[PDB]
Amino acid sequence: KKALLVVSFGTSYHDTCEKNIVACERDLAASCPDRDLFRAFTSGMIIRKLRQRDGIDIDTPLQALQKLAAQGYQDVAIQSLHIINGDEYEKIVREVQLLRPLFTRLTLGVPLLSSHNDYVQLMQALRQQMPSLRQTEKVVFMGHGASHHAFAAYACLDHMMTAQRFPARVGAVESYPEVDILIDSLRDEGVTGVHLMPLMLVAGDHAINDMASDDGDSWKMRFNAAGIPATPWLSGLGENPAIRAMFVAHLHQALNM
Amino acid sequence: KKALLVVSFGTSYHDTCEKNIVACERDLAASCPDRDLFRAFTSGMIIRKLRQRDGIDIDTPLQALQKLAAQGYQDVAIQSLHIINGDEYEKIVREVQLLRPLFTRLTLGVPLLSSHNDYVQLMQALRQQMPSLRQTEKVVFMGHGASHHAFAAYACLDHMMTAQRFPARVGAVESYPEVDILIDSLRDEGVTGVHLMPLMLVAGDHAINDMASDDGDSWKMRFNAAGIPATPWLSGLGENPAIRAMFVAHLHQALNM
Amino acid sequence: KKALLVVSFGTSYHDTCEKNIVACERDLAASCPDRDLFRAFTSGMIIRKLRQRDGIDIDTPLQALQKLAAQGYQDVAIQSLHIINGDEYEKIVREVQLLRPLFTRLTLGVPLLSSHNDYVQLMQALRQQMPSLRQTEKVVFMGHGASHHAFAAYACLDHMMTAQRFPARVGAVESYPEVDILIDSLRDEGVTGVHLMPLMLVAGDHAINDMASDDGDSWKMRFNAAGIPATPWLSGLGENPAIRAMFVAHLHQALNM
Amino acid sequence: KKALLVVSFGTSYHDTCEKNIVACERDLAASCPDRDLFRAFTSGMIIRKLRQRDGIDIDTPLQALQKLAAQGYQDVAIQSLHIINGDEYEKIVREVQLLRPLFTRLTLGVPLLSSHNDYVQLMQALRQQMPSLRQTEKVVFMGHGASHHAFAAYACLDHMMTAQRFPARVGAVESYPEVDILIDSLRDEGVTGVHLMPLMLVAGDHAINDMASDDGDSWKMRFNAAGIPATPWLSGLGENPAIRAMFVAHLHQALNM
Amino acid sequence: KKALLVVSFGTSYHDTCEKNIVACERDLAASCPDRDLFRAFTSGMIIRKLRQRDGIDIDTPLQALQKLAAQGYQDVAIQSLHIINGDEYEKIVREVQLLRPLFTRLTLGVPLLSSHNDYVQLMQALRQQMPSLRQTEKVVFMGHGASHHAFAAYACLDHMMTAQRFPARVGAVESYPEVDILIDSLRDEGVTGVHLMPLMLVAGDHAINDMASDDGDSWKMRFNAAGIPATPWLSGLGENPAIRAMFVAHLHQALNM
Amino acid sequence: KKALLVVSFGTSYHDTCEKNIVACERDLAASCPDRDLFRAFTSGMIIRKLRQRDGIDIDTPLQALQKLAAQGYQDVAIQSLHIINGDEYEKIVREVQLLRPLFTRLTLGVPLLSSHNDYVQLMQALRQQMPSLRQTEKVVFMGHGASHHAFAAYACLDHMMTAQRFPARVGAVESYPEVDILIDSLRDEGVTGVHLMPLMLVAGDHAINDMASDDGDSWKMRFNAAGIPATPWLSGLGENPAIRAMFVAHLHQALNM
DSSP states (O other): OEEEEEEEOOOSOHHHIIIIIIHHHHHHHHHOTTSEEEEEESOHHHHHHIIIIIOOOOOOHHHHHHHHHHTTOOEEEEEEOOSSSSHHHHHHHHHHHHHGGGOSEEEEEOOSSOSHHHHHHHHHHHHTTSOOOOTTEEEEEEEOOOSSGGGHHHHHHHHHHHHTTOSEEEEESSSSSOHHHHHHHHHHHTOOEEEEEEOSSOOOHHHHHHHHSSSTTSHHHHHHHTTOOEEEOOOOGGGOHHHHHHHHHHHHHHHBO | OEEEEEEEOOOSOHHHIIIIIIHHHHHHHHHOTTSEEEEEESOHHHHHHIIIIIOOOOOOHHHHHHHHHHTTOOEEEEEEOOSSSSHHHHHHHHHHHHHGGGOSEEEEEOOSSOSHHHHHHHHHHHHTTSOOOOTTEEEEEEEOOOSSGGGHHHHHHHHHHHHTTOSEEEEESSSSSOHHHHHHHHHHHTOOEEEEEEOSSOOOHHHHHHHHSSSTTSHHHHHHHTTOOEEEOOOOGGGOHHHHHHHHHHHHHHHBO | OEEEEEEEOOOSOHHHIIIIIIHHHHHHHHHOTTSEEEEEESOHHHHHHIIIIIOOOOOOHHHHHHHHHHTTOOEEEEEEOOSSSSHHHHHHHHHHHHHGGGOSEEEEEOOSSOSHHHHHHHHHHHHTTSOOOOTTEEEEEEEOOOSSGGGHHHHHHHHHHHHTTOSEEEEESSSSSOHHHHHHHHHHHTOOEEEEEEOSSOOOHHHHHHHHSSSTTSHHHHHHHTTOOEEEOOOOGGGOHHHHHHHHHHHHHHHBO | OEEEEEEEOOOSOHHHIIIIIIHHHHHHHHHOTTSEEEEEESOHHHHHHIIIIIOOOOOOHHHHHHHHHHTTOOEEEEEEOOSSSSHHHHHHHHHHHHHGGGOSEEEEEOOSSOSHHHHHHHHHHHHTTSOOOOTTEEEEEEEOOOSSGGGHHHHHHHHHHHHTTOSEEEEESSSSSOHHHHHHHHHHHTOOEEEEEEOSSOOOHHHHHHHHSSSTTSHHHHHHHTTOOEEEOOOOGGGOHHHHHHHHHHHHHHHBO | OEEEEEEEOOOSOHHHIIIIIIHHHHHHHHHOTTSEEEEEESOHHHHHHIIIIIOOOOOOHHHHHHHHHHTTOOEEEEEEOOSSSSHHHHHHHHHHHHHGGGOSEEEEEOOSSOSHHHHHHHHHHHHTTSOOOOTTEEEEEEEOOOSSGGGHHHHHHHHHHHHTTOSEEEEESSSSSOHHHHHHHHHHHTOOEEEEEEOSSOOOHHHHHHHHSSSTTSHHHHHHHTTOOEEEOOOOGGGOHHHHHHHHHHHHHHHBO | OEEEEEEEOOOSOHHHIIIIIIHHHHHHHHHOTTSEEEEEESOHHHHHHIIIIIOOOOOOHHHHHHHHHHTTOOEEEEEEOOSSSSHHHHHHHHHHHHHGGGOSEEEEEOOSSOSHHHHHHHHHHHHTTSOOOOTTEEEEEEEOOOSSGGGHHHHHHHHHHHHTTOSEEEEESSSSSOHHHHHHHHHHHTOOEEEEEEOSSOOOHHHHHHHHSSSTTSHHHHHHHTTOOEEEOOOOGGGOHHHHHHHHHHHHHHHBO
């Protein structure tokens, strides 16, 4: 008796949830058609907003696991839709560790950016949502960032891009490299325009405001103020089938050893 | 009743242990003169070699904690001398988690490269073991690397160096960026010579062989083969007082909140 | 400050719950008149049906334990009303293990079929719900079965019956021995009629359908098709005072050592 | 990201809750202005009464911790408003122990009467809610008591008072020294009148009934029957700023080491 | 970095250990050639005898796991060589549960007699160590037995044999069915001779004494006294390649899901 | 399969160990003649001294429990020979909590001074090692003391003695009431001589030095300097059969509920 639990950071914005979190849950459920599908979010604030504003009840990972144990699932596979191994993913790791003894079999599949091969595969996957660029144009990816030590992931990926002359850059809102680092670096290459894309699973209004709004600290205004015009593309990573396939391979690696 | 437990990766080489692990234990003990000092190593292989070859018994973190609980220490402060938050540090985290209920108070201080400020402070600390360089010369730091996701730390630090035009580079033996990435990148800047230094707590013969030997895959031979002569400096980071002071600040941050 | 928690598999059928689970809770509470009485069910599906269809709220064992800890019970005795040591009982064992540290004293009394003496005592107890049979008639007991390894209990009990020439047989719906095994074996003895009784705590409509319905795979139709007419008796084991007394002795054995 | 959780025994009486538990939560929050403030009660019975009678929902410590983990608090400081280290405080210790792995940093500050210095400081703090007495008058403090071994605290404090000729006595409703012990002892000194004060955080109607009512077993009637007239003062300890400052020092000692 | 830990009940008899436990460890290691091989025994008494008499040190499962964690194995596969899910296997389950958090990945493969298919496959495997029998001759298998509830396994297997007219019987030394049950049952079939084989992983001198000695309570003397001559075959199950292949399939099922 | 583990604080002095710890282990083993007897000490320092000076190996409670689990004991009863519920007893509680899942049944019997009835029974038991005193003479008991909150036990017992006019007093070396408190209080009663007895399980040379030596801070010199001559009696509490019987009743209360 078998479950698949898919844990997202979450979003209160319905249309982006459907285009991204649902599309990933759909693909993961198809790869495990012998599993019943369940959802949980790590963001308690988002869960609370959904309850109070919308009357929609999303489980935390602890609640989802308690319910799975209650309903008699002995075998639970969990897949994180997080991008990095930071506080949010670790919330899953810790809750899983606490309740692990309630199950005969548990596995837990890791965030997008975990191993060295993940970074290589992610660059390949990102290539499928990028346009054909001229030599003085680049795509710029905007991640959340982190205070947790896993914030190092964003710079490592940017470093790999630069080393292989991939035509994109990566930074973070809340951590290094911040947008001014990339702007200084791109200005020195004589990059002439950029396309901004989120390096986040969903693109909710606040992500959109950090990237694209008319606020002077938006990434678009910052690039524009440097004389490098910026065109925002408002899709989450969940909307890219090659990203979904990496989440599917992680679940399947958690399943096999 | 109070203990300080200092946990290193470890080394079987006595002279480097004294110059690096002992110098750090000395400084940490001085900052907590109300604590009795204890040692443990994460590397079981190194512990085994010390027992079998030398008749020297070093505790694992689990054994050190069992002994501390037995001897009646209610208050234990632990400081990791690791460089990154990878498998080795996590071995400490997990053993601490298991035995935490044996103590009234426990804290655990983090590896050198944890927060965004650690990277900035580490660059400042490394500056005190570097020579005054000409504009076409750089220091190259050689870390261990990791398969764990924390391998991203080495590239993030290299990325920070490059962004601020710090006159050094960082890579890893076993993970990205490997030495050929740095060589290609430095050759493109017209860097003319490098000084190799380990980005490891100790400099044991095997680290020395990866960095400095006459094997074609040593970092020195690789730089030399690219026509960039390399001068190896065989000190561990433990020998740098500004690195020791960061480990001391981490212990003290674990102590205060 | 003392509690008695009685944990059943559960049922959504009110009349069988009263005749079986309530009768057992009543007897256990009388044997521990210094304890406040609490209920929990292992079947989450049954709990959910009761909430959604009936507005009746039954605790899982985890919820019951959290509430007991909250209300200040330091001393909790738990008795399982399960028949075997399979997945359902183990759900209790695991939840008890997780929350055990919340209590000064906990005990947990075992399912009906645990030790060698339980099987002997159960045969004696079953004898009090059986009629006086002619030599070519037998009682046939229908257990649930299990995929868990404790499914072996049903065959072991059948084996004991046969060895001592007890005038009954035991099998399981979902596991070995299935009804065709018993039918082949009884047909070879020249058994001429059987009375079917559940070897389950309660007799809900679905148990009744497996045993007694006009579906060709019901145990009654299967015996009838073999030319051995079958008379269904629709009581759960909870309705037998000698079964209740075994559950009472298990609680009391959990209490004493 | 930082929380302060303040855990009380609790009360269903609103006016005493405000004058005592709120005043303590207020002071603790002011000493940690970087923390978001949360409440939990140990008394499940009181929590249940508040829900069912008032529609007010107070968390148990387990629920508060689950919610804190859900909302992403990595750093939680908890302060107990209990008077002694008995069953109620231990409920906190046990729930904290269970959920500790959900947090990067946790601390837990201890009840009022913990160390030898607490007793000395409490005597000093009580002096600020006492009147100037004549030599044949004393204040009598009425604690709850305990079956747990920490009941010894009340006699130890009474013993310290007597040794230093502090003009007060301490006993307990439910444990040693009960009021008749103090009455016999005070009668032998020729004490002529007493003022009764609770040695409890709040003064709810039931505390007030034990201390002050016209029931023959109230502490006031007992002293009066011995010919030592008793004047009840119906404030909880929470109403005394010097008691609040001890709870603040405990939180701050939990924070520093 | 990957380990295989093979846990036996154990034996102090060297020749049977080699022919049985070593042959199983050999096969399991060949099926996981990417794993380093480790041993542990559940029988502490046997471990103690080996240390004190022979100077041979065998790990308990806890010690083996501590050492694996120390040496940096992140991925450990464990296979039990036990026959049933009783106290001995559960010792593994409990120690694994305790130390599970020390590893990134752990699995645990189950005893020979676990699922319904195991019993069918075991009957097939036993057929390869049996002779071609005449119709009045049978093989009798002698298991250890158990007080734990898993003792039911031996009767369940005997029941399956009888149902399918397999030409063997199974019982236990220490639990039901004891040898007299099988003797009474075989005498009633007019069975004329039996071959005794152990249903134990190893055949040490004490197993051999229970089965084969000249003591009146040996299984051989008991059958002989009933006028059914008994020929003892002194091999453990480990010596049967089809049994080894079931242990290999269990490890591989633990590995895949 | 059943064990009795008796855990002492410990002593390095052989003669006092035999007269006290052995006499208690003897009595406890006689009350549980179905249990195999085991020893552990809480004092790691004492354990270390015994190993290094004497070649005697005493288990910590963790080691004793690991060995019990290894040897297959499913049912372990543990009895503490401690006097109070302080750090030493809690070391047992915590180690028991950690390893509890390794056993089917565990219980843990509490220190001498736990419940209100323990204090009453202890006063009765102490009466059997006291002489017949004149009205101006008293026995003075010398406990260890504690920084842990359970130090309150010593004053509570002294308070009970005084309240009931029992002809003894109690204090502690390391905590309140210290000897000067008792001396001031006894001098005010016109007590003319005292007999000093330890309120410790064993009377080792250091206890003897605190109580009896010619050092000015010994309890004997302090009483003598106050003009109240003191006669030391150098027996531990273990030597008193009525104390042993309380430890036996605690084990038996842990066994029954």
